[PDB]
Amino acid sequence: ESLTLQPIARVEGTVNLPGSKSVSNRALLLAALARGTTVLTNLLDSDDVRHMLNALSALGVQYTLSADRTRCEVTGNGGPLRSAAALELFLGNAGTAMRPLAAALCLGSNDIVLTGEPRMKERPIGHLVDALRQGGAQIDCLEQENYPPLRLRGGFQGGNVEVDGSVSSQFLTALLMTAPLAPQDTVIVIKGDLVSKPYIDITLHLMKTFGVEVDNQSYQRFVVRGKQQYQSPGDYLVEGDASSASYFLAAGAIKGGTVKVTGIGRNSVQGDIRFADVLEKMGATVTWGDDFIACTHGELKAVDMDMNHIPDAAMTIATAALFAQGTTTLRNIYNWRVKETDRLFAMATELRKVGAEVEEGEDYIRITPPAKLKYAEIGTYNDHRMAMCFSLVALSDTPVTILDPKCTAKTFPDYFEQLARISTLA
Fold first, then answer.
1. Contact 239, 26 (CB under 8 A)
2. Beta partners for residue 15, in sequence order
3. Is 169 within any annotated ligand binding site?
4. Is 95 annotated as contributing to ligand binding?
5. CB 133 within 8 Å of CB 140
6. Where in the cell (predicted)?
7. Which of 59, 30, 27, 52 is nearest to 41 (CA)?
8. By three-state DSSP, how is residue 69 classified?
9. Alpha carbon distance 53, 6 (integer Å)
10. Does the annotation place 382 within a ligand binding site?
Protein backbone atom coordinates (compact mmCIF):
# COMPACT_ATOMS: atom_id res chain seq x y z
CA GLU A 1 0.00 0.00 0.00
CA SER A 2 2.15 2.85 -1.33
CA LEU A 3 1.68 5.82 -3.61
CA THR A 4 4.15 6.32 -6.44
CA LEU A 5 4.40 9.95 -7.51
CA GLN A 6 5.23 10.36 -11.18
CA PRO A 7 7.54 13.21 -12.21
CA ILE A 8 5.88 16.61 -12.45
CA ALA A 9 6.90 19.08 -15.14
CA ARG A 10 5.26 22.09 -13.51
CA VAL A 11 2.61 23.09 -10.96
CA GLU A 12 0.34 26.17 -10.78
CA GLY A 13 -3.06 26.80 -9.19
CA THR A 14 -5.09 27.16 -6.01
CA VAL A 15 -5.36 24.81 -3.03
CA ASN A 16 -7.97 25.34 -0.28
CA LEU A 17 -6.65 24.04 3.04
CA PRO A 18 -9.18 22.03 5.07
CA GLY A 19 -9.62 23.17 8.62
CA SER A 20 -7.01 22.65 11.27
CA LYS A 21 -7.96 19.80 13.57
CA SER A 22 -6.78 22.01 16.44
CA VAL A 23 -8.86 25.00 15.41
CA SER A 24 -11.77 22.74 14.45
CA ASN A 25 -12.12 21.05 17.83
CA ARG A 26 -11.49 24.27 19.79
CA ALA A 27 -14.16 26.13 17.76
CA LEU A 28 -16.69 23.31 18.03
CA LEU A 29 -16.27 23.36 21.81
CA LEU A 30 -16.55 27.14 22.12
CA ALA A 31 -19.63 27.18 19.86
CA ALA A 32 -21.07 24.40 22.02
CA LEU A 33 -20.57 26.51 25.13
CA ALA A 34 -21.54 29.84 23.59
CA ARG A 35 -24.70 31.92 23.67
CA GLY A 36 -26.17 31.81 20.16
CA THR A 37 -25.79 29.81 16.96
CA THR A 38 -22.32 29.64 15.46
CA VAL A 39 -21.84 28.72 11.80
CA LEU A 40 -18.46 27.01 11.31
CA THR A 41 -17.07 27.06 7.76
CA ASN A 42 -14.04 25.06 6.52
CA LEU A 43 -14.47 22.52 9.34
CA LEU A 44 -12.14 19.54 9.14
CA ASP A 45 -13.79 16.21 8.34
CA SER A 46 -11.49 13.77 10.12
CA ASP A 47 -12.45 11.00 12.45
CA ASP A 48 -11.03 12.92 15.42
CA VAL A 49 -13.42 15.76 14.59
CA ARG A 50 -16.11 13.11 14.24
CA HIS A 51 -15.47 11.92 17.79
CA MET A 52 -15.69 15.53 18.93
CA LEU A 53 -19.06 15.95 17.22
CA ASN A 54 -20.34 12.60 18.54
CA ALA A 55 -19.31 13.55 22.08
CA LEU A 56 -20.97 16.98 21.86
CA SER A 57 -24.15 15.36 20.49
CA ALA A 58 -24.13 12.87 23.37
CA LEU A 59 -23.86 15.92 25.64
CA GLY A 60 -27.09 17.30 24.17
CA VAL A 61 -25.46 19.87 21.86
CA GLN A 62 -27.59 20.35 18.76
CA TYR A 63 -25.98 21.09 15.40
CA THR A 64 -26.43 20.42 11.71
CA LEU A 65 -23.68 19.34 9.31
CA SER A 66 -23.36 19.83 5.59
CA ALA A 67 -23.30 16.84 3.26
CA ASP A 68 -19.50 17.00 3.06
CA ARG A 69 -19.29 17.63 6.84
CA THR A 70 -17.16 20.78 6.43
CA ARG A 71 -19.96 23.21 7.37
CA CYS A 72 -21.60 22.98 10.80
CA GLU A 73 -24.12 25.21 12.56
CA VAL A 74 -24.13 24.83 16.33
CA THR A 75 -26.86 25.88 18.73
CA GLY A 76 -24.78 26.89 21.73
CA ASN A 77 -25.61 25.73 25.23
CA GLY A 78 -24.94 29.19 26.59
CA GLY A 79 -23.17 27.56 29.50
CA PRO A 80 -21.54 24.42 30.84
CA LEU A 81 -22.64 21.20 29.19
CA ARG A 82 -25.19 19.24 31.23
CA SER A 83 -25.90 15.51 31.15
CA ALA A 84 -28.58 14.00 33.38
CA ALA A 85 -27.42 10.48 32.60
CA ALA A 86 -23.95 9.19 33.30
CA LEU A 87 -22.00 9.00 30.04
CA GLU A 88 -18.97 7.16 28.67
CA LEU A 89 -17.48 8.87 25.61
CA PHE A 90 -15.01 7.13 23.27
CA LEU A 91 -12.76 9.72 21.64
CA GLY A 92 -10.88 7.32 19.38
CA ASN A 93 -7.40 8.78 19.12
CA ALA A 94 -8.38 12.49 19.28
CA GLY A 95 -6.23 14.11 21.94
CA THR A 96 -7.19 17.51 20.54
CA ALA A 97 -10.67 16.42 21.62
CA MET A 98 -9.70 14.59 24.84
CA ARG A 99 -7.87 17.53 26.39
CA PRO A 100 -10.42 20.35 25.75
CA LEU A 101 -13.32 18.10 26.77
CA ALA A 102 -11.50 16.81 29.85
CA ALA A 103 -11.20 20.39 31.06
CA ALA A 104 -14.66 21.59 30.00
CA LEU A 105 -16.47 18.62 31.58
CA CYS A 106 -15.07 19.58 34.99
CA LEU A 107 -17.74 22.26 34.86
CA GLY A 108 -21.10 21.34 36.31
CA SER A 109 -22.16 18.25 38.26
CA ASN A 110 -22.03 15.50 35.65
CA ASP A 111 -20.70 11.95 35.77
CA ILE A 112 -18.90 11.27 32.49
CA VAL A 113 -16.03 8.93 31.59
CA LEU A 114 -13.63 9.94 28.79
CA THR A 115 -11.70 7.18 27.09
CA GLY A 116 -10.29 6.22 23.74
CA GLU A 117 -7.93 3.93 21.91
CA PRO A 118 -4.82 2.39 23.51
CA ARG A 119 -2.61 4.93 21.72
CA MET A 120 -4.45 7.79 23.45
CA LYS A 121 -4.59 5.96 26.80
CA GLU A 122 -0.78 6.15 26.41
CA ARG A 123 -0.79 9.94 25.85
CA PRO A 124 -0.10 11.66 29.22
CA ILE A 125 -2.77 14.01 30.54
CA GLY A 126 -1.70 14.31 34.18
CA HIS A 127 -0.39 17.87 33.80
CA LEU A 128 -3.96 18.86 32.94
CA VAL A 129 -5.60 16.64 35.61
CA ASP A 130 -3.42 18.14 38.35
CA ALA A 131 -4.41 21.69 37.45
CA LEU A 132 -8.10 20.80 37.21
CA ARG A 133 -8.10 19.01 40.58
CA GLN A 134 -6.25 22.02 41.99
CA GLY A 135 -9.17 24.24 41.04
CA GLY A 136 -11.57 21.71 42.51
CA ALA A 137 -12.51 19.25 39.75
CA GLN A 138 -13.26 15.70 40.89
CA ILE A 139 -11.27 13.48 38.50
CA ASP A 140 -10.72 9.75 38.95
CA CYS A 141 -8.05 8.00 36.86
CA LEU A 142 -9.69 4.62 36.36
CA GLU A 143 -6.58 2.67 35.42
CA GLN A 144 -3.52 4.81 36.22
CA GLU A 145 -2.68 8.35 37.17
CA ASN A 146 -1.48 10.67 34.32
CA TYR A 147 -3.56 8.91 31.62
CA PRO A 148 -7.14 8.15 30.48
CA PRO A 149 -9.66 6.65 31.13
CA LEU A 150 -10.98 9.54 33.25
CA ARG A 151 -14.12 9.75 35.38
CA LEU A 152 -15.27 13.37 35.49
CA ARG A 153 -17.71 14.38 38.20
CA GLY A 154 -17.12 18.11 37.77
CA GLY A 155 -16.69 20.69 40.47
CA PHE A 156 -14.23 23.10 38.86
CA GLN A 157 -14.16 26.27 40.99
CA GLY A 158 -11.44 28.44 39.51
CA GLY A 159 -8.92 30.01 41.87
CA ASN A 160 -5.14 29.69 42.05
CA VAL A 161 -3.89 26.81 39.90
CA GLU A 162 -0.62 25.80 38.24
CA VAL A 163 0.04 23.89 35.03
CA ASP A 164 3.23 22.44 33.61
CA GLY A 165 3.95 24.02 30.25
CA SER A 166 7.28 22.29 29.74
CA VAL A 167 5.95 19.23 27.87
CA SER A 168 2.79 20.36 26.06
CA SER A 169 0.91 23.59 25.59
CA GLN A 170 -2.43 21.75 25.09
CA PHE A 171 -2.93 21.33 28.83
CA LEU A 172 -2.89 25.11 29.27
CA THR A 173 -5.17 25.48 26.24
CA ALA A 174 -7.81 23.19 27.75
CA LEU A 175 -7.55 25.05 31.08
CA LEU A 176 -7.91 28.47 29.44
CA MET A 177 -10.99 27.50 27.47
CA THR A 178 -12.69 26.14 30.61
CA ALA A 179 -11.70 28.90 33.05
CA PRO A 180 -14.12 31.70 31.97
CA LEU A 181 -17.15 29.63 33.01
CA ALA A 182 -15.79 28.95 36.51
CA PRO A 183 -17.51 30.79 39.38
CA GLN A 184 -14.18 32.21 40.61
CA ASP A 185 -11.49 34.17 38.86
CA THR A 186 -8.77 31.75 37.77
CA VAL A 187 -5.06 32.53 38.13
CA ILE A 188 -3.00 30.03 36.13
CA VAL A 189 0.73 29.97 36.87
CA ILE A 190 3.04 28.24 34.38
CA LYS A 191 5.65 26.05 36.08
CA GLY A 192 8.65 26.32 33.80
CA ASP A 193 8.98 27.68 30.32
CA LEU A 194 5.94 27.51 28.06
CA VAL A 195 6.45 25.33 24.99
CA SER A 196 4.54 26.01 21.75
CA LYS A 197 3.39 29.54 22.57
CA PRO A 198 1.72 30.16 19.15
CA TYR A 199 -0.92 27.50 19.85
CA ILE A 200 -1.59 29.48 23.03
CA ASP A 201 -1.97 32.53 20.80
CA ILE A 202 -4.43 30.58 18.67
CA THR A 203 -6.53 29.57 21.65
CA LEU A 204 -6.57 33.08 23.13
CA HIS A 205 -7.63 34.57 19.77
CA LEU A 206 -10.48 32.07 19.37
CA MET A 207 -11.61 32.92 22.89
CA LYS A 208 -11.60 36.63 22.10
CA THR A 209 -13.53 35.90 18.89
CA PHE A 210 -16.14 34.36 21.28
CA GLY A 211 -16.13 37.52 23.48
CA VAL A 212 -13.72 36.57 26.29
CA GLU A 213 -10.53 38.46 27.17
CA VAL A 214 -7.60 36.95 29.02
CA ASP A 215 -4.70 38.65 30.80
CA ASN A 216 -1.56 36.95 29.45
CA GLN A 217 1.42 37.91 31.63
CA SER A 218 4.62 36.97 29.72
CA TYR A 219 3.26 33.43 29.09
CA GLN A 220 3.96 32.91 32.80
CA ARG A 221 0.68 33.87 34.51
CA PHE A 222 -2.81 33.92 32.92
CA VAL A 223 -5.67 35.82 34.64
CA VAL A 224 -9.19 34.80 33.57
CA ARG A 225 -12.22 36.51 35.05
CA GLY A 226 -14.87 34.00 36.07
CA LYS A 227 -18.64 34.00 35.65
CA GLN A 228 -18.43 34.82 31.93
CA GLN A 229 -20.24 33.30 28.97
CA TYR A 230 -19.02 32.89 25.41
CA GLN A 231 -20.95 34.76 22.75
CA SER A 232 -21.28 33.30 19.28
CA PRO A 233 -19.56 35.39 16.59
CA GLY A 234 -22.19 34.10 14.18
CA ASP A 235 -20.05 33.01 11.26
CA TYR A 236 -16.64 31.52 11.99
CA LEU A 237 -14.19 30.28 9.33
CA VAL A 238 -11.93 27.48 10.58
CA GLU A 239 -8.49 28.38 9.39
CA GLY A 240 -6.47 25.67 7.73
CA ASP A 241 -3.35 24.33 9.39
CA ALA A 242 -0.44 26.59 8.47
CA SER A 243 2.08 23.74 8.17
CA SER A 244 0.01 22.12 5.43
CA ALA A 245 0.37 25.22 3.24
CA SER A 246 4.16 24.89 3.39
CA TYR A 247 4.22 21.95 1.00
CA PHE A 248 2.23 23.70 -1.74
CA LEU A 249 4.04 27.01 -1.31
CA ALA A 250 7.29 25.07 -1.65
CA ALA A 251 5.83 23.28 -4.69
CA GLY A 252 5.27 26.64 -6.36
CA ALA A 253 8.70 27.95 -5.35
CA ILE A 254 10.37 24.84 -6.76
CA LYS A 255 8.51 24.14 -9.95
CA GLY A 256 5.84 26.76 -10.50
CA GLY A 257 4.11 28.51 -11.86
CA THR A 258 2.32 30.12 -8.95
CA VAL A 259 0.74 28.12 -6.13
CA LYS A 260 -1.91 29.93 -4.07
CA VAL A 261 -3.16 28.41 -0.80
CA THR A 262 -6.42 29.54 0.81
CA GLY A 263 -7.71 28.78 4.28
CA ILE A 264 -4.77 30.76 5.75
CA GLY A 265 -3.80 34.41 5.49
CA ARG A 266 -1.25 37.16 6.02
CA ASN A 267 -2.80 37.94 9.41
CA SER A 268 -2.80 34.50 11.00
CA VAL A 269 -1.60 33.91 14.57
CA GLN A 270 -0.36 30.44 13.68
CA GLY A 271 3.42 30.32 13.94
CA ASP A 272 4.17 28.30 10.84
CA ILE A 273 3.01 31.07 8.46
CA ARG A 274 6.54 32.40 8.93
CA PHE A 275 7.64 29.42 6.78
CA ALA A 276 6.79 31.57 3.77
CA ASP A 277 9.42 34.18 4.67
CA VAL A 278 12.06 31.45 4.39
CA LEU A 279 11.03 30.69 0.80
CA GLU A 280 11.31 34.40 0.06
CA LYS A 281 14.88 34.29 1.34
CA MET A 282 15.67 31.25 -0.85
CA GLY A 283 14.82 33.32 -3.94
CA ALA A 284 11.09 32.67 -4.33
CA THR A 285 8.40 35.30 -4.72
CA VAL A 286 5.89 35.39 -1.86
CA THR A 287 2.60 37.28 -2.11
CA TRP A 288 0.97 37.93 1.28
CA GLY A 289 -2.79 37.86 0.82
CA ASP A 290 -5.56 38.46 3.29
CA ASP A 291 -7.17 35.02 3.16
CA PHE A 292 -4.44 33.32 1.11
CA ILE A 293 -0.69 33.09 0.62
CA ALA A 294 0.98 32.49 -2.75
CA CYS A 295 4.42 31.38 -3.91
CA THR A 296 5.80 31.88 -7.42
CA HIS A 297 8.99 30.17 -8.61
CA GLY A 298 12.32 31.90 -8.38
CA GLU A 299 15.76 30.33 -8.68
CA LEU A 300 16.19 28.65 -5.28
CA LYS A 301 19.37 29.28 -3.28
CA ALA A 302 20.37 27.49 -0.10
CA VAL A 303 20.02 29.14 3.31
CA ASP A 304 21.53 28.91 6.78
CA MET A 305 18.94 29.73 9.41
CA ASP A 306 17.79 29.03 12.91
CA MET A 307 14.59 27.05 12.34
CA ASN A 308 13.73 26.94 16.05
CA HIS A 309 10.55 28.93 15.57
CA ILE A 310 8.87 26.77 12.88
CA PRO A 311 9.40 23.09 13.87
CA ASP A 312 6.73 21.60 11.60
CA ALA A 313 7.31 23.51 8.35
CA ALA A 314 11.10 23.38 8.81
CA MET A 315 10.90 19.76 7.62
CA THR A 316 9.42 21.16 4.40
CA ILE A 317 12.48 23.39 4.09
CA ALA A 318 14.61 20.25 4.47
CA THR A 319 13.05 18.65 1.40
CA ALA A 320 12.86 21.89 -0.62
CA ALA A 321 16.64 22.30 -0.15
CA LEU A 322 17.07 19.40 -2.60
CA PHE A 323 16.29 21.98 -5.33
CA ALA A 324 18.21 25.03 -4.04
CA GLN A 325 21.75 25.87 -5.06
CA GLY A 326 24.16 25.36 -2.20
CA THR A 327 24.27 23.59 1.12
CA THR A 328 21.34 24.39 3.39
CA THR A 329 21.74 24.30 7.17
CA LEU A 330 18.66 24.15 9.43
CA ARG A 331 19.81 25.21 12.89
CA ASN A 332 18.57 24.81 16.46
CA ILE A 333 16.03 22.10 15.62
CA TYR A 334 16.73 19.89 18.61
CA ASN A 335 12.94 19.94 18.95
CA TRP A 336 12.91 17.27 16.25
CA ARG A 337 14.79 14.79 18.40
CA VAL A 338 12.39 15.19 21.35
CA LYS A 339 9.19 14.20 19.54
CA GLU A 340 7.14 11.03 19.17
CA THR A 341 9.98 9.89 16.92
CA ASP A 342 13.33 11.56 16.27
CA ARG A 343 12.63 13.61 13.16
CA LEU A 344 16.27 14.60 12.77
CA PHE A 345 17.45 11.01 12.36
CA ALA A 346 14.40 10.18 10.23
CA MET A 347 14.76 13.12 7.82
CA ALA A 348 18.51 12.49 7.46
CA THR A 349 17.91 8.80 6.73
CA GLU A 350 15.26 9.43 4.11
CA LEU A 351 17.13 12.35 2.48
CA ARG A 352 20.18 10.16 1.93
CA LYS A 353 18.06 7.69 -0.06
CA VAL A 354 17.18 10.30 -2.74
CA GLY A 355 20.88 11.06 -3.16
CA ALA A 356 21.48 13.88 -0.66
CA GLU A 357 24.61 14.42 1.42
CA VAL A 358 23.27 14.87 4.94
CA GLU A 359 24.96 15.98 8.17
CA GLU A 360 23.06 15.08 11.35
CA GLY A 361 24.30 17.43 14.06
CA GLU A 362 23.17 17.61 17.67
CA ASP A 363 20.52 20.25 16.91
CA TYR A 364 20.87 20.97 13.19
CA ILE A 365 20.76 19.30 9.79
CA ARG A 366 22.98 20.20 6.84
CA ILE A 367 21.77 19.19 3.37
CA THR A 368 23.85 19.17 0.16
CA PRO A 369 21.60 18.15 -2.76
CA PRO A 370 22.70 15.55 -5.29
CA ALA A 371 23.43 16.56 -8.86
CA LYS A 372 20.68 14.05 -9.76
CA LEU A 373 17.81 12.84 -7.58
CA LYS A 374 17.36 9.11 -6.97
CA TYR A 375 14.13 7.13 -6.89
CA ALA A 376 13.46 5.69 -3.41
CA GLU A 377 10.65 4.25 -1.25
CA ILE A 378 10.31 6.88 1.50
CA GLY A 379 9.37 5.58 4.93
CA THR A 380 7.07 8.01 6.66
CA TYR A 381 7.25 6.98 10.34
CA ASN A 382 3.50 7.38 10.98
CA ASP A 383 4.24 11.05 10.29
CA HIS A 384 2.05 12.85 7.77
CA ARG A 385 4.79 15.50 7.78
CA MET A 386 7.22 13.01 6.26
CA ALA A 387 4.83 11.99 3.50
CA MET A 388 4.02 15.60 2.63
CA CYS A 389 7.69 16.69 2.82
CA PHE A 390 9.07 13.98 0.45
CA SER A 391 6.08 14.39 -1.94
CA LEU A 392 8.18 17.30 -3.35
CA VAL A 393 10.81 14.86 -4.68
CA ALA A 394 8.61 14.29 -7.75
CA LEU A 395 9.03 18.03 -8.53
CA SER A 396 11.87 16.83 -10.73
CA ASP A 397 12.65 14.21 -13.38
CA THR A 398 12.44 11.51 -10.74
CA PRO A 399 9.49 9.58 -9.26
CA VAL A 400 9.17 8.87 -5.58
CA THR A 401 7.21 6.22 -3.69
CA ILE A 402 5.66 7.26 -0.39
CA LEU A 403 5.03 4.51 2.17
CA ASP A 404 1.93 4.58 4.40
CA PRO A 405 0.43 7.51 2.44
CA LYS A 406 -2.83 7.30 4.46
CA CYS A 407 -0.80 8.76 7.38
CA THR A 408 -1.72 12.09 5.69
CA ALA A 409 -5.48 11.30 5.88
CA LYS A 410 -5.05 12.33 9.56
CA THR A 411 -4.71 16.02 8.50
CA PHE A 412 -4.90 16.03 4.66
CA PRO A 413 -6.46 12.97 2.90
CA ASP A 414 -7.02 15.10 -0.27
CA TYR A 415 -3.33 16.18 -0.13
CA PHE A 416 -2.14 14.13 -3.16
CA GLU A 417 -5.32 14.59 -5.17
CA GLN A 418 -5.01 18.36 -4.73
CA LEU A 419 -1.30 18.05 -5.44
CA ALA A 420 -2.38 16.20 -8.59
CA ARG A 421 -4.93 18.77 -9.64
CA ILE A 422 -2.27 21.52 -9.71
CA SER A 423 0.28 19.21 -11.39
CA THR A 424 1.18 18.77 -15.04
CA LEU A 425 2.98 15.44 -15.32
CA ALA A 426 6.09 15.11 -17.45
1. no
2. 261
3. yes
4. yes
5. no
6. Cytoplasm
7. 27
8. coil
9. 38
10. no
